[PDB]
Structure 1
C-alpha cells in the first residue's frame, strides 16, 4: 500500500457533469485534472470505486489520482473503498477541495482538522479520520449559510477564477515535494503563495 507521509493518493472533490465542471465546488477537480495532464496520468472510468481514477509516475513515485463521481456529499462512497482497497493510509492522502474560509488566490496545505462545513470532507472524515492532507483552494464565502449552496455551485467571475488558477498552478509545482514526503517544505511554500 502507501509508505509513510509520501503522498501516493491525490483526490480532487467536485460534482460530475458539464453543468458543474466550471463551478467553485469543483476546485479540487481542476487541480487534479491539471496535475494528471502535467504528469501524463490517465484519468479513466473507475465504476468499481464510483469515480474516475488514474495511476502513474510522479517524480519517480507510483501515485494514484481519484475524482469521485458520486456527487460531492457522497464523496466518501468513492474515497473510502478506493483508499482501503489500495491500502493507502490517510497520512499518504492529499484531498484537494474548495475552501469557503479563504480568499480566491489563497491556497494552503493543511494536515488534519475538521471538514469546515465542506459537504465532501464531511462524507470522508467519519470513515478514515482526519489525518489526511488537504489542499485548501480559497473560493471565498457568500456571507449567508443560506447562500453557500448557490456560491459553491456558481461559476466565479474572471478575476476570482484567475486568482484561483494562479494558486492551483503554484500548488502543481509543489506536488514533487509531497510525493517525496517533504510535507513541511510543501506546506511552507504552498502557504506562502501570493497572487501579486
Structure 2
C-alpha cells in the first residue's frame, strides 16, 4: 500500500483515441506520458482496471501511473478500483487534469477541494473523497458556459500549447519532491511558475 503523503499513484485524466489525444481535456495524459518517458516507466495495457498503467522507480520510490481509458466522465471506473486494489490512500494520489479556471501556462498543485466542474474529477471524488492532490494544468475558459465542450475538446492554438507545454515541463521537474512527500515545497515551487 501507499505510505503517508509520499505520492505513489499519479493519474492523468483524458479521453482515449487519436481524435482526443491533442485536445485540451487530455492535459493530464500529456503530463503523465511525459513523466513516464522521463523516468522510463512503461505504460501498458491494463484491461482489469480499464486503463493504461505502469509501475516504476521515481527517485528511489515505487510509483504507479494510470491513464483511465473509460472516457473522461467514467474516470472513476478506473481510478477507484485501481487505488483500492493496490491499497493506495487518496493522500498518496496525484491527479493531473486540465483546469478551465486557470490560464494556459499557469499550473498549480492543490490538495482537496471539489471538481470545479471537471467531469473526470466529478466521477472520482464521490468514491474516494476529496483528499487527493491535483496538478491543475491551466487551459483557459471559453467565451461562455455553453462553449465548455467545444473548448476542452478543442486543440489549442500553438501559443497556448507552448504555454501549457512549458508549465508541464516545469511540473515534471518537481515530481521528485512529491514522491518524497514534500508536498508543501512542491506546492510553493509549482505554483510560482511563470512562462516568461
TM-score bin (small chain):
over 0.9
Instruction: Determine the structure 2 residue equivalent to 1:142.
Output: 142
**How many Å apart are 1:3 and its aligned residue?**
0.1
Aligned pair count reads: 196
SS in 2 for 1:20: coil
Specify every segment of 5 or more residues in structure 2 that has no aligned partner in the other structure, as ranges. Answer: none
Q: Distance in 2 between matches of 1:143 and 1:98?
A: 17
1:156 is the counterpart of 2:177: no
Deviations 1:161-192 (Å, cap 9, x if unpaired)? 00000000000000000000000000000000
Cα-Cα RMSD: 0.3
**How many Å apart are 1:145 and its aligned residue?**
1.7
Q: Distance in 2 between matches of 1:100 and 1:134?
A: 14
Deviations 1:115-141 (Å, cap 9, x if unpaired)? 000000000000000000000000000
Matches within 5 A, 1:127-138: 127-138=127-138
Instruction: Determine the structure 1 residue equivalent to 2:94.
Output: 94
Q: Distance in 2 between matches of 1:122 and 1:105?
A: 24
Specify every segment of 5 or more residues in structure 1 that has no aligned partner in the other structure, as ranges. Answer: none
SS in 2 for 1:136: strand
Matches within 5 A, 1:12-23: 12-23=12-23
Find runs of 4+ consecutive structure 1 residues off by over 6 angstroms: none
**How many Å apart are 1:143 and its aligned residue?**
2.5
TM-score (norm 2): 1.00
SS in 2 for 1:96: strand
